[PDB]
Amino acid sequence: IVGGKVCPKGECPWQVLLLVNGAQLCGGTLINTIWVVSAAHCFDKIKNWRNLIAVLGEHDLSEHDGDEQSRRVAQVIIPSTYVPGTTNHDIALLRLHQPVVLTDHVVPLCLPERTFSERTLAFVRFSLVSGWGQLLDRGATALELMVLNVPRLMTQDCLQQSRKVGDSPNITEYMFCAGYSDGSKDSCKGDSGGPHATHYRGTWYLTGIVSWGQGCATVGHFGVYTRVSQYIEWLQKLMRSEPRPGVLLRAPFP
Amino acid sequence: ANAFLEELRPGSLERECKEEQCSFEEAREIFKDAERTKLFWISYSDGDQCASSPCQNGGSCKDQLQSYICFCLPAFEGRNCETHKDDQLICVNENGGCEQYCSDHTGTKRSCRCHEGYSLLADGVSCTPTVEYPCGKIPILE
Amino acid sequence: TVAAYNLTWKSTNFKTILEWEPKPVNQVYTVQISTKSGDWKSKCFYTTDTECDLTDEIVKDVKQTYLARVFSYPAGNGEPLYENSPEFTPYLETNLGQPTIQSFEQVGTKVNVTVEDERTLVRRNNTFLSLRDVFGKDLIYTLYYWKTAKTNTNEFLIDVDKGENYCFSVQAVIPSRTVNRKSTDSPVECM
Numbered sequence: 167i168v169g170g171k172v173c174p175k176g177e178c179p180w181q182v183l184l185l186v187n188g189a190q191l192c193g194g195t196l197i198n199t200i201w202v203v204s205a206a207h208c209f210d211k212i213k214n215w216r217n218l219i220a221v222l223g224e225h226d227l228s229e230h231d232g233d234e235q236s237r238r239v240a241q242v243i244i245p246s247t248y249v250p251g252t253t254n255h256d257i258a259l260l261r262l263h264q265p266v267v268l269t270d271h272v273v274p275l276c277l278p279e280r281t282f283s284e285r286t287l288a289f290v291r292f293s294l295v296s297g298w299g300q301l302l303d304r305g306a307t308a309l310e311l312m313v314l315n316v317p318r319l320m321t322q323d324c325l326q327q328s329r330k331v332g333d334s335p336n337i338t339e340y341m342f343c344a345g346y347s348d349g350s351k352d353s354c355k356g357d358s359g360g361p362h363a364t365h366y367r368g369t370w371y372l373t374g375i376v377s378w379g380q381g382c383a384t385v386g387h388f389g390v391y392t393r394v395s396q397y398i399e400w401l402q403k404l405m406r407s408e409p410r411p412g413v414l415l416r417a418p419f420p
Numbered sequence: 421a422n423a424f425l426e427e428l429r430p431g432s433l434e435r436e437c438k439e440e441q442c443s444f445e446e447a448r449e450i451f452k453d454a455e456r457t458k459l460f461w462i463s464y465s466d467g468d469q470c471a472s473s474p475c476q477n478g479g480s481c482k483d484q485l486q487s488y489i490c491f492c493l494p495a496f497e498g499r500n501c502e503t504h505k506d507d508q509l510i511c512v513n514e515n516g517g518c519e520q521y522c523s524d525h526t527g528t529k530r531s532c533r534c535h536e537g538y539s540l541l542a543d544g545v546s547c548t549p550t551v552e553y554p555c556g557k558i559p560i561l562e
Numbered sequence: 563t564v565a566a567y568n569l570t571w572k573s574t575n576f577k578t579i580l581e582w583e584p585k586p587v588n589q590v591y592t593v594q595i596s597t598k599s600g601d602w603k604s605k606c607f608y609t610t611d612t613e614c615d616l617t618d619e620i621v622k623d624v625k626q627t628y629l630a631r632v633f634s635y636p637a638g639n640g641e642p643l644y645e646n647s648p649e650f651t652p653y654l655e656t657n658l659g660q661p662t663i664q665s666f667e668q669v670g671t672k673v674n675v676t677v678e679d680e681r682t683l684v685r686r687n688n689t690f691l692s693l694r695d696v697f698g699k700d701l702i703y704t705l706y707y708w709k710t711a712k713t714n715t716n717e718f719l720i721d722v723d724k725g726e727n728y729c730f731s732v733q734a735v736i737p738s739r740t741v742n743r744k745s746t747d748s749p750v751e752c753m
């Protein structure tokens with residue numbers, strides 16, 4: 167996160183830290199006691215599928231306390247349409263091997279229905295993005311969880327304002343822009359998989375996943391987030407599925 | 421207006437324009453200067469655009485030049501107070517007032533629903549947790 | 563479908579209507595309005611009109627700056643096509659309505675001319691505010707008589723040659739504006 171603040175411990179209680187071979191990999195969002203949503207691209211270079219861990223209740227990566235809960239990741243489910251090395255369909259659903267235990271420091275974010283998300287949540291201007299990613303583009307990651315409030319744009323507005331870059335990825339119906347074009351504030355590398363969370367009438371909902379941006383807080387560019395509303399039925403169906411033996415499952419989308 | 425030997429009388433705004441309709445020339449006979457006459461004439465001949473009663477639903481009309489403004493009662497809006505705020509209870513209008521999920525039902529009233537972990541209250545729109553740690557709430561702040 | 567165009571704000575005494583083109587053919591419209599940091603509120607849902615009254619939203623704060631956008635939806639129904647309006651700041655841009663002379667009186671050697679309070683669409687405490695309630699010292703009235711007088715209130719006190727009949731017309735003015743600075747002249751009234 168660039169230009170954010172530290173999230174007071176306990177105030178981002180659905181944030182997940184994913185680790186691969188005990189090293190920090192990406193963020194994620196807890197959506198009930200067993201299932202986490204993150205970004206597909208986080209898993210492009212994984213070789214040791216059996217050494218993925220999700221940590222809930224984390225805040226300060228330099229100190230341990232009794233609020234952290236770690237669970238092995240039993241399954242990583244990615245849409246079959248996702249192409250490694252590219253940005254479209256940038257979502258993963260992770261099944262934890264055992265449930266985390268809900269506490270004052272560990273609570274899921276609500277996964278909304280599609281129509282509610284498209285018709286109501288999409289028009290709430292600001293939402294929170296969070297993570298332990300880079301503090302500056304090409305700068306060292308954060309030790310304390312950081313959070314940032316960002317405004318959402320419809321794609322037509324995002325496209326016109328944005329400085330043209332030759333060879334850049336298309337903004338598709340599966341993604342939406344949010345943030346600021348003036349260089350001040352954005353999510354960044356190492357925040358991927360983390361929630362874009364929207365508050366509506368006293369409850370918080372998952373509306374985006376940190377996905378891709380040109381650098382981070384580049385002038386003339388916004389952060390781009392996976393539109394989670396396009397995957398509600400896909401996530402719901404998969405959460406009803408029976409576990410497979412291998413960890414990675416490519417599942418058809420739609 | 422003109423009648424036998426009335427034009428022997430000097431002109432009178434009240435007699436000729438307020439109590440009767442006056443022609444442009446009768447008006448000019450009163451004001452004399454062309455510019456004074458046109459300033460009078462611009463409004464006098466404009467017409468009362470409120471005479472068609474355009475403001476609906478108990479609203480109030482104020483005449484302007486070639487135009488009017490409608491002041492609506494609190495339950496109406498629109499140029500002519502034609503839109504009934506009470507007829508607007510559909511999910512795209514502020515989520516139908518549902519706290520969480522809204523479902524349209526054509527002909528009959530929209531209904532409101534809740535995420536798992538919550539249940540719908542007596543009021544048909546509010547949601548209440550049914551579990552200790554429902555999704556989307558921050559325990560240390562509540 | 564085609565996006566709306568020539569989005570234009572029509573506003574007098576805070577009654578504020580957005581207008582656009584074109585007439586729809588197999589498409590309907592919905593309007594949204596917001597302030598720069600606020601949430602978008604929908605209005606005129608699936609209308610086939612090419613106007614949308616936004617008075618009730620903008621009178622919540624007439625000094626805010628509002629952005630509207632008009633969505634076009636294919637008849638019977640990704641993100642839709644849409645077009646943004648110009649920004650609109652009601653206190654700076656609303657037209658001042660045509661005023662009316664309420665009365666004039668000869669108080670001996672002088673004539674008082676009183677301008678009727680000009681009602682606006684801003685409500686407070688369940689009643690409509692006047693232009694002077696909203697603008698305060700930003701609003702003056704000007705009187706043309708037969709030459710000119712100006713007032714910080716709704717009344718003028720002018721000197722008159724006795725037994726002579728005078729004619730009056732008045733204009734609402736916001737002297738700090740450069741555009742839409744003055745109303746049209748009131749109807750002329752005469753002694």
Ligand SMILES: *C[C@@](*)(O)[C@H](CCCNC(=N)N)NC(=O)CNC(=O)[C@H](CCC(=O)O)NS(=O)(=O)c1cccc2c(N(C)C)cccc12
Nearest residue numbers: 333353354355356357358377378379380381382383389390
């Ligand atoms: C994996 C996540 O931790 C991280 C989150 C970044 C969120 N960023 C912002 N909110 N600003 N996501 C990624 O690292 C995914 N990759 C990129 O964002 C990528 C980084 C390179 C860069 O130029 O910044 N940028 S990109 O998505 O725009 C992108 C993707 C693919 C190809 C690109 C090229 N080509 C064709 C070589 C050029 C430029 C950007 C490209």
Ligand SMILES: *[C@@H]1O[C@H](CO)[C@@H](O)[C@H](O)[C@H]1O
Nearest residue numbers: 468469470471472473474
């Ligand atoms: C008289 O009323 C009609 C509608 O009833 C309106 O269109 C005119 O503008 C008004 O003068």
Ligand SMILES: *[C@@H]1O[C@@H](C)[C@@H](O)[C@@H](O)[C@@H]1O
Nearest residue numbers: 478479480481491492493
């Ligand atoms: C004019 O104003 C409207 C709002 C209503 O109150 C009417 O009763 C009145 O004449």
Ligand SMILES: [Ca+2]
Nearest residue numbers: 226227229230
């Ligand atoms: Ca820790």
Ligand SMILES: [Ca+2]
Nearest residue numbers: 421422426436
């Ligand atoms: Ca006569």
Ligand SMILES: [Ca+2]
Nearest residue numbers: 421422436446
């Ligand atoms: Ca006559």
Ligand SMILES: [Ca+2]
Nearest residue numbers: 427431446449
């Ligand atoms: Ca005459």
Ligand SMILES: [Ca+2]
Nearest residue numbers: 435436439440
């Ligand atoms: Ca007569």
Ligand SMILES: [Ca+2]
Nearest residue numbers: 427445446449
């Ligand atoms: Ca004559």
Ligand SMILES: [Ca+2]
Nearest residue numbers: 466467484486
């Ligand atoms: Ca008129």
Ligand SMILES: [Cl-]
Nearest residue numbers: 237238263264
């Ligand atoms: Cl485990």
Ligand SMILES: [Cl-]
Nearest residue numbers: 379380381382
């Ligand atoms: Cl990036």
Ligand SMILES: [Cl-]
Nearest residue numbers: 679680693694
């Ligand atoms: Cl006034």
Ligand SMILES: [Mg+2]
Nearest residue numbers: 434435438439
């Ligand atoms: Mg008389």
Ligand SMILES: [Mg+2]
Nearest residue numbers: 445446448449
């Ligand atoms: Mg004559």
Ligand code: NA
Nearest residue numbers: 347349383384
């Ligand atoms: Na920027």
